[PDB]
Design a protein around this ligand. Structure first.
Ligand code: CLA
Ligand code: CLA
Ligand code: CLA
Ligand code: CLA
Ligand code: CLA
Ligand code: CLA
Ligand code: CLA
Ligand code: CLA
Ligand SMILES: CCCCCCCCCCCCCCCC(=O)OC[C@H](COP(=O)(O)OC[C@@H](O)CO)OC(=O)CCCCCCCCCCCCCCC
Ligand SMILES: CC1=C(/C=C/C(C)=C/C=C/C(C)=C/C=C/C=C(C)/C=C/C=C(C)/C=C/C2=C(C)CCCC2(C)C)C(C)(C)CCC1
Ligand code: SF4
Ligand code: SF4
Lengths: 733, 75, 124, 37, 165, 144, 40, 80
């Protein structure tokens, strides 16, 4: 029998090309490996996590190295407004001379790619100024990468393998991660801002060679130990400060200005230092909550057992959930993905509207790429969270040990949950689509005054509450006679109110009927995606159609043509369907973000305000109009620097369409076809002397769904990335 | 098959009828190059009468592309 | 059982196939590879010379085309080597054996590279 | 001292695009077809 | 005004939009004779257009910077400033008709489940029975509440099939 | 009843051949032989495509997989009222009689058969997957 | 006649009549009350 | 090989055995049902996993169940 894979003897004895495919697909599903034990499972995961960490730091090392070696960071810092950052150099022997000339830009000697990741603005804001800084950081992160890689090897050795009980000490890990990994790290980052980043933004060089002889504040720690903490808020940078120089600079290190720096149009460095200092204190305190070897604190199991409503409205309440969560790696991973997935979206929503990095707002391509990049990652992470929630119910859930608690009661009214999600999705779909179609017909018949335009008064009311005076509601921060307006008028409201009432930034953009319709489209996407993922999880164990589904596992082809036909009945298939809707939803979200910023960046918000209320407007004015420079990257008359994006644009369409082959045509057709090829090869002279070692077979039913989805997803992402970058940079490059 | 033929005759009869009653064929015969064939006219309701375009020959309607006018002239 | 056709079973066809070095048993595997290597190495230079990225350069075209063909011979020889490693791990014709195939692959490299060189000489 | 020589791309790009992938594919191919004892 | 909007009767963009729409029709009307049918059709469209812009302004709709009417959906704002006829009143118009349809269909379904072959009454409609129920559906809001208060609107959980959990 | 012995000398049905027959698997791994007695010459359909004529008396055909032999068995039994049997033949000459296993076709209950893979419970009485976790491999609760 | 009136009570025929009637009512209302966007 | 199991809800109707295209199942004597016979799965090394047997079973829920397992030349249905 074949050696590969070593972890599955069932696969190793498979005589077909299936084995290689499934050897790869099942490699990281440790629970399914031959001879796996619970303790060995945890130790294997622990080592894999070290592998991920070293990879991440090596990836960061590479980005630092190539910018220092091949970028123009030193030139960029002298004029960030009028210079394009360089990602890395191009060396491609397939280029012709015109391509060599076209990609030679940004001051470099040879062809280069322009960076869209925003690392230049990030590294500049935190004090990096020279290629030497980037080089040293690169070497440091490579060393940290090696140490993590070594630590992963070390803790696999006989005397360094943690026991199972070590991995299940929830109280101790939470204490350390809250106070140490979150709190101390935040406190240390505050030190960097106070000691390095803030002085650098004021024209002073502080490095390892002199940071022990430079006072962050003229009064060194005297205010800190005497309680006169207001001494650090005095003399902030003025409104005329020139970032990176001492002109108009202040002396404060901890402030609450609460707006944007007038030149860089980003958050104040002294506000970001005070933010992390306060966060550090909160997290350090929070990490002293749970009981450890010192006889104080909370036991998590005790807390859960106590929270049972007396009326019995939640049944047994949270009884048994400590063991359920603590014993299920899939319950933990589901929670982690859901939390990180939502946090990734928050990063996207807050970074565009409250830019933290200097000269980020004016780099339109970077702003578009970063929002789109993190929202798509959030979308994938959310699908995974529900996927592992469904895996939990099958593999890990024990009905007897969760008898009557909140988790078991969710299964008791799953039909109520699914049917109400179905109703919400139907209502949003019928009426959002209906209103768009009504407006398209009114536009088509030349009567734009007959279209249905519903003002988003609820959202505009919230914007007024935050101080936006455009809508005239005039209450809370919009009312100068309110207590909320008065109380904060000395801390942060002046800066905040100046920023929110400027319509040239992204801080609470003006909204109208076009924003109303698209927000309900997004709600349609969120609810429908949740419906598919939730239905998949709650029916994962069984349904009226397949009562014993849990006996078949998370992923399996089907249950055959019987009982009416059971294609795509597994919980895995529900996830597969949900990804299409996640891509559609994020597509609607990012289309919305991009078009609203393109018209803002072009100084004509009226085009969005008037074209976004009907769908021909999106097709004509967003997609068709903004494709012109992209599709001319190369043509019969020549090519320019957008040729790579033009080529990638079609590359994306091609992969997308190839995926349709695997999704539409199914296995039986192909298996019959391959048999005729098997016959032909054995009957062909000079070719039947060669022979295969793995009998060729068509891809499996499940495998086709995954591969087809992969092509669909990759083409989806590449097509939009090319359109996003080319349409933005071509306009503003 | 007789059923299918019956339906085709109804369809053909409708085309000839709409050419007789809802078209600009007579005007088109005089100036075939400068007039657009038209044999469908929409009722004025919910603003849809914009679809009755100015196809020439003192007539308003949807421009047809089936070529019936050219077939009728040939016969 | 099987369908017999003039193409599959003919005297002229069968005699021709037996004469080819692939089907000529009783010959050392190394010699088999050299004869097969020479035939394929010679033809391989053609398309590279006449249709390569340097086809229009007056004299560089011959060197680049044949030099690229030599690189493809090396890749093909590596494919033969790994095929023998995989296929033969545990009979009448020595060619279909772990030792025989390795010798056959080595002959293909020497014959193939020589064929490319001979083609270059013919051009110039 | 960190700056690589000007000729590094001429070597590393072919090395990681043609040579190392060729070795990796050849090594992996033999491994996945190897027969267990 | 509400949310920075302005009345359409006072909006320059709203007035300009009407001129453009009429101007487009006037240009087409030039190529036709006074009494010809195309001229009559175009003028009828022009009269409808002028009435439309007159009616919307009279109804007190708010117009945006684009000059297009914008609807107000919050019941408080709608009732305070006389916009209840835009969303609020239409809301209860729909729910009355929608519940009428739903309630009548439910009555028919329950009525035919006592027959010998219930499924035959679902593909061959008992029109005399359906017609009687249609007329009696005008009082569904009263009838529905009484069933809700009598505990007969909903079925008991012990009689509803569910899958294993 | 006793296990029959295969007779390789048996004549085969008249058939001109096709491209749908045996491949290299028969030479190296195994193939299948089906035999039956025909009352008269008659045309039947080959599972590999085409029409063949069964000779009167013994008949013998060879197939590449077990499903092909049983597919022809079903045709002969239901459309002609015959009683075929087939074997598995290994490259080294070993013959393994297969069907009918004990001389009586499986759909007819026969004495002396011992139940296999019979669970004395309903499907709804299988345990949850959590109870068989970490058993040494992937296994369903139906396997216990 | 009983059978023919039974045929006219089948789902597709009833749907055709009912939707023809419902469409006619909605079309005729818009004929006499054109361009209704709000209730006054 | 696939895993085929017979459960004690079997009525001994023989339809699964008649429907099996691979001769995996057979009927054996039993006393738990009126027919006094139960389905058996003696030769599961030949099961291809088509689930025709499950399609033929009249009981609710099924009395014959196929769980797809490791793939061999036989279970994959290859003739090569
Ligand atoms: C912290 C993150 C995390 C972790 C630790 C895991 C861990 C696990 N997941 Mg989970 N998962 C996650 C996130 C995570 N997941 C997310 C974000 C999603 C949503 C996308 C999912 C969705 C998901 C599903 C649906 C399943 C798992 C499964 C698994 C298990 C097996 C994984 C395996 O063998 O993959 C093997 C991986 C591969 C063979 C590679 C897949 C490559 C994909 C298709 C992308 C290819 C991109 C392509 C190459 C790009 C080319 C570009 C071109 C220009 C060149 C394992 C316990 C499986 C299981 O059985 O769990 C019990 C399972 O079915 N996960
Ligand atoms: C543009 C494509 C498209 C559209 C319009 C829909 C629409 C729908 N999908 Mg589907 N879906 C799609 C693509 C699409 N899907 C793709 C590519 C996949 C991946 C395989 C899925 C996977 C999927 C899943 C897994 C689920 C859905 C669900 C839904 C529903 C969501 C709720 C909703 O909108 O209700 C309102 C309904 C609509 C907007 C549908 C269109 C209604 C039209 C306009 C009616 C017109 C009637 C009119 C008289 C004309 C009739 C003419 C005719 C008689 C000739 C809805 C029926 C969910 C569902 O069923 O929720 C209950 C669900 O679970 N979809
Ligand atoms: C000269 C004699 C003649 C003519 C003109 C036709 C004409 C036709 N036959 Mg044919 N047919 C004939 C003799 C004839 N048949 C004979 C002798 C036989 C028996 C062997 C058949 C058996 C036969 C069958 C089984 C079928 C046809 C069908 C058709 C129709 C094919 C569709 C088509 O081209 O539509 C072109 C349409 C027209 C040109 C319209 C012509 C209408 C007038 C009334 C003439 C129809 C011909 C008829 C024989 C006239 C006398 C009928 C009666 C009063 C005596 C077409 C109308 C097919 C069909 O659609 O049948 C309904 C069909 O299924 N024929
Ligand atoms: C293929 C066959 C066909 C089709 C698709 C149409 C389609 C049409 N016809 Mg025509 N028509 C046809 C055959 C056809 N006709 C035939 C055979 C005749 C002769 C009896 C007519 C006589 C006729 C008249 C007299 C009129 C139309 C009209 C119409 C239009 C409106 C119909 C309507 O809404 O009725 C209402 C729907 C129901 C009663 C249900 C529509 C474009 C009308 C038109 O053009 O108005 C400007 C119109 O007045 N048709
Ligand atoms: C994961 C991080 C990463 C990534 C994605 C890249 C990506 C790239 N590198 Mg870079 N590189 C990195 C880290 C990385 N590098 C590091 C840490 C070093 C310092 C040792 C280098 C040193 C380096 C050189 C000297 C060259 C590249 C080059 C390249 C390009 C072609 C691939 C190549 O030759 O790789 C080669 C990669 C290495 C020699 C280092 C690999 C290290 C890990 C551990 C394996 C490509 C843009 C080439 C280029 O610029 O072409 C225009 C080139 O000549 N890289
Ligand atoms: C990163 C990967 C990579 C690299 C470095 C190259 C490099 C090259 N490609 Mg490309 N190529 C790649 C990936 C790559 N390719 C892929 C993935 C594909 C498939 C989509 C292609 C498809 C492709 C085609 C179709 C063609 C090229 C060609 C070329 C050449 C263009 C320059 C020229 O005019 O050469 C002219 C040729 C020369 C100057 C000869 C250079 C030396 C040859 C190639 C090898 C000599 C070997 C030597 C005799 C013995 C071994 C020595 C060694 C041990 C040191 C160049 C050698 C062109 C070419 O000429 O190919 C031969 C060409 O026609 N490539
Ligand atoms: C869908 C949710 C929703 C939202 C976000 C709003 C939002 C709003 N409503 Mg509306 N409202 C809603 C649903 C909603 N309403 C519904 C369903 C009804 C019918 C029962 C009403 C009935 C209503 C009235 C009668 C009034 C408002 C008013 C308001 C505005 C100011 C009061 C406030 O703080 O409301 C925030 C909303 C909530 C916390 C939810 C409950 C709101 C209740 C039903 C009304 C509270 C009125 C408030 C005490 C009036 C204070 C004096 C006023 C002059 C500011 C605000 C924009 C006031 C306004 O500005 O009128 C011009 C007002 O007088 N609403
Ligand atoms: C969510 C879906 C939706 C909604 C809410 C509306 C709403 C409206 N549409 Mg629009 N429309 C839609 C989808 C929608 N449309 C779609 C999909 C299309 C494409 C087919 C159109 C095409 C369209 C046209 C072409 C027109 C409208 C018009 C209208 C208005 C009709 C009012 C009316 O007839 O009152 C009549 C009054 C009533 C009370 C009707 C009910 C009568 C019963 C007897 C009441 C019984 C009560 C007891 C209204 C504002 C018309 C308009 O003027 O809009 C400004 C108009 O001309 N729509
Ligand atoms: C009527 C006259 C007017 C006054 C009525 C007062 C009713 C008080 C409620 C009694 C209602 C009642 O009997 O409750 C009973 C039940 C509480 O169950 P227990 O078993 O804990 O308690 C029963 C007690 O009555 C006796 O112990 O609560 C509910 O069902 C709803 C609770 C609503 C809780 C509201 C706050 C929820 C916040 C969630 C997070 C929101 C985030 C977003 C917004 C910030
Ligand atoms: C199936 C399943 C699962 C999964 C799940 C999931 C995936 C979920 C998700 C979820 C989610 C994803 C959620 C979310 C949520 C959220 C929330 C709940 C929020 C809240 C918020 C708030 C409350 C806020 C507030 C505020 C504002 C608004 C403003 C001002 C400030 C403040 C803060 C006051 C698990 C694993 C468990 C297992 C079992 C089964
Ligand atoms: S799955 Fe198919 S081959 Fe297996 S026992 Fe059932 S019917 Fe027979
Ligand atoms: S079909 Fe079902 S009930 Fe009938 S014998 Fe087979 S397993 Fe038993």
């Amino acid at each position: 029998t074949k050696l590969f894979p070593k972890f599955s003897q069932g696969l190793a004895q498979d005589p077909t090309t299936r084995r290689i495919w499934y050897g790869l697909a099942m490699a990281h599903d440790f629970e399914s490996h031959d001879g796996m034990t619970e303790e060995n499972l945890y130790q294997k995961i622990f080592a894999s996590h070290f592998g991920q960490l070293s990879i991440i730091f090596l990836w960061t090392s590479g980005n630092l190295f190539h910018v220092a070696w091949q970028g123009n960071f030193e030139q960029w810092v002298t004029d960030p407004v009028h210079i394009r950052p360089i990602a890395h150099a191009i060396w491609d022997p397939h280029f012709g001379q015109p391509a060599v000339e076209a990609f030679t830009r940004g001051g470099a000697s040879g062809p280069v790619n322009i960076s869209t990741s925003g690392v230049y603005q990030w590294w500049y804001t935190i004090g990096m100024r020279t290629n030497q800084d980037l080089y040293v950081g690169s070497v440091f992160l490579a060393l940290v990468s090696a140490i993590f890689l070594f630590a992963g090897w070390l803790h696999l050795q006989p005397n360094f393998q943690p026991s199972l009980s070590w991995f299940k000490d929830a109280e101790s890990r939470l204490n350390h991660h809250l106070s140490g990994l979150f709190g101390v790290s935040s406190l240390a980052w505050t030190g960097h801002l106070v000691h390095v980043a803030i002085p650098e933004s004021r024209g002073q060089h502080v490095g390892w060679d002199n940071f022990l002889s430079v006072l962050p504040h003229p009064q060194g720690l005297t205010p800190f130990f005497t309680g006169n903490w207001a001494a650090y808020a005095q003399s902030p940078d003025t409104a005329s400060h020139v970032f990176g120089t001492a002109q108009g600079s202040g002396q404060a290190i901890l402030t609450f200005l609460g707006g944007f720096h007038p030149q860089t149009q980003s958050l104040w460095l002294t506000d970001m230092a005070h933010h992390h200092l306060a966060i550090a204190v909160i997290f350090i305190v929070a990490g002293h909550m749970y009981r450890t070897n010192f006889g104080i604190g909370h036991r998590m199991q005790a807390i859960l057992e106590a929270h049972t409503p007396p009326s019995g409205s939640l049944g047994a309440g949270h009884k048994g959930l400590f063991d359920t969560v603590n014993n299920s790696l899939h319950f933990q991973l589901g929670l982690a993905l859901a939390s990180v997935g939502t946090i990734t979206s928050l990063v996207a929503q807050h970074m565009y509207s409250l830019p933290p990095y200097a000269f980020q707002a004016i780099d339109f391509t970077t702003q578009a790429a970063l929002y789109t990049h993190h929202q798509y990652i959030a979308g994938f992470i959310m699908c995974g969270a529900f996927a592992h929630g469904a895996i939990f119910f099958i593999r890990d859930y024990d009905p007897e040990q969760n008898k009557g608690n909140v988790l078991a009661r969710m299964l008791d009214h799953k039909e109520a949950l699914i049917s109400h999600l179905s109703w919400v999705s139907l209502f949003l779909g019928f009426h959002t689509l209906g209103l768009y179609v009504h407006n398209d017909v009114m536009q088509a018949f030349g009567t734009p005054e007959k279209q249905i335009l519903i003002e988003p008064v609820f959202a505009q009311w919230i914007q007024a509450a935050h101080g936006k005076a455009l809508y005239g509601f005039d209450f809370l921060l919009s009312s100068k006679t309110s207590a909320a307006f008065a109380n904060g008028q000395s801390l942060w409201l002046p800066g905040w109110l100046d920023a929110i009432n400027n319509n040239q930034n992204s801080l609470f953009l003006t909204i109208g009927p076009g924003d109303f319709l698209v927000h309900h489209a997004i709600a349609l996407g969120l609810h429908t995606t949740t419906l598919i993922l939730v239905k998949g999880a709650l029916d994962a164990r069984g349904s009226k159609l397949m009562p014993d589904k849990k006996d078949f596992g998370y992923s399996f082809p089907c249950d055959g043509p019987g009982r009416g036909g059971t294609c795509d009945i597994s919980a895995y298939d529900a996830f597969y369907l949900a990804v299409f809707w996640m891509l559609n939803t994020i597509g609607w979200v990012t289309f919305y973000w991009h078009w609203k910023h393109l018209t803002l960046w072009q100084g004509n918000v009226a085009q969005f305000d008037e074209s976004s209320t009907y769908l021909m407007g999106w097709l004509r004015d967003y997609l068709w109009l903004n494709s012109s420079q992209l599709i001319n990257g190369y043509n019969p008359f020549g090519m320019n620097s957008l040729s790579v994006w033009a080529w990638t644009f079609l590359f994306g369409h091609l992969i997308y369409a190839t995926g349709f082959m695997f999704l539409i045509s199914w296995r039986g057709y192909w298996q019959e076809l391959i048999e005729t090829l098997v016959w032909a090869h054995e009957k062909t002279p000079l070719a039947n002397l060669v022979y295969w070692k793995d009998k060729p077979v068509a891809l499996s039913i499940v495998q086709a769904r995954l591969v087809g989805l992969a092509h669909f997803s990759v083409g989806y992402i590449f097509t939009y990335a090319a359109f996003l970058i080319a349409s933005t940079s071509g306009r503003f490059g | 098959h007789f059923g299918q033929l019956g339906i085709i005759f109804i369809w053909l009869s409708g085309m000839y009828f709409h050419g007789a009653r809802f078209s600009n064929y007579e005007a088109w015969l005089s100036d075939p190059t400068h007039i657009k064939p038209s044999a469908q006219v929409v009722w004025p309701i919910v603003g849809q009468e914009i679809l009755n375009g100015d196809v020439g020959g003192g007539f308003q309607g949807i421009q047809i592309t089936s070529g019936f006018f050219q077939l009728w002239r040939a016969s | 059982g099987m369908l017999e056709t003039p193409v599959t079973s003919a005297p002229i066809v069968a005699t021709y196939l037996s004469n080819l070095p692939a089907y000529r048993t009783g010959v050392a595997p190394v010699l088999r590879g050299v004869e097969i290597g020479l035939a394929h190495g010679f033809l391989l230079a053609g398309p590279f010379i006449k249709l390569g990225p340097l086809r229009n350069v007056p004299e560089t075209a011959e060197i680049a085309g044949s030099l690229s063909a030599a690189g493809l011979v090396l890749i093909l020889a590596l494919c033969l080597s790994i095929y023998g490693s995989a296929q033969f791990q545990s009979a009448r014709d020595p060619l279909f054996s772990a030792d025989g195939w390795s010798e056959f692959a080595a002959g293909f490299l020497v014959g193939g590279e020589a064929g490319v060189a001979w083609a270059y000489v013919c051009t110039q | 001292p960190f700056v690589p020589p000007s000729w590094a791309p001429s070597v590393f790009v072919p090395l990681t695009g043609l040579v190392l992938p060729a070795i990796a594919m050849a090594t992996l191919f033999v491994y996945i077809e190897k027969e267990a004892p | 005004d509400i949310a920075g909007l302005t009345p359409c009767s006072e909006s320059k963009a709203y007035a300009k939009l009407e001129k453009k729409e009429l101007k487009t029709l006037e240009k087409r009307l030039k190529q036709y004779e006074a009494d010809s049918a195309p001229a009559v059709a175009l003028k009828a469209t022009m009269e409808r257009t002028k009435a439309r812009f007159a009616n919307y302004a009279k109804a007190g709709l708010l117009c945006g910077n684009d000059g297009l009417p914008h609807l107000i959906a919050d019941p408080g704002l709608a009732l305070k400033y006389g916009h209840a006829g835009e969303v609020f009143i239409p809301t209860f118009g729909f729910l009355y008709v929608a519940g009428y349809i739903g309630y009548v269909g439910r009555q028919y379904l329950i009525a035919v489940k006592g027959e010998a072959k219930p499924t035959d009454k679902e593909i061959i409609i008992d029109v005399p029975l359906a017609t009687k129920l249609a007329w009696q559906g005008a009082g569904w809001p009263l009838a529905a509440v009484q069933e809700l208060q009598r505990g007969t609107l909903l079925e008991k959980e012990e009689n509803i099939t569910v899958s294993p959990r | 009843w006793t296990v029959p012995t295969l007779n390789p000398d048996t004549p085969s049905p008249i058939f001109g051949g096709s491209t749908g027959g045996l491949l290299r698997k028969a030479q190296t791994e195994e193939f299948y032989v089906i035999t039956w007695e025909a009352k008269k010459e008659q045309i039947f359909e080959m599972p590999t495509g085409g029409a063949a004529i069964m000779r009167q008396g013994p008949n013998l055909l060879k197939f590449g997989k077990k499903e092909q032999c049983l597919a022809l068995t079903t045709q002969l039994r239901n459309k002609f009222k015959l009683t075929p049997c087939f074997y598995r033949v290994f490259p080294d000459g070993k013959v393994q009689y297969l069907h009918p296993a004990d001389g009586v076709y499986p759909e007819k209950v026969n004495a002396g058969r011992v139940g296999a893979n019979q669970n004395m419970r309903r499907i709804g009485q299988n345990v949850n997957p959590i109870k068989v976790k970490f058993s040494g491999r992937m296994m369903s609760p139906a396997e216990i | 006649m009983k059978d023919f009136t039974t045929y006219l009570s089948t789902a597709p025929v009833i749907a055709t009549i009912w939707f023809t009637f419902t469409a006619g009512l909605l079309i005729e209302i818009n004929r006499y009350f054109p361009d209704p966007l709000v209730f006054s | 090989a696939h895993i085929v199991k017979i459960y004690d809800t079997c009525i001994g109707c023989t339809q699964c055995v008649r429907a099996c295209p691979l001769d995996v199942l057979e009927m054996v004597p039993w006393d738990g049902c009126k027919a006094s016979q139960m389905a058996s799965a003696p030769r599961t090394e030949d099961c291809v996993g088509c689930k025709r047997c499950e399609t033929a079973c009249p009981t609710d829920f099924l009395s014959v169940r196929v769980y797809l397992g490791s793939e061999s030349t036989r279970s994959m249905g290859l003739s090569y």
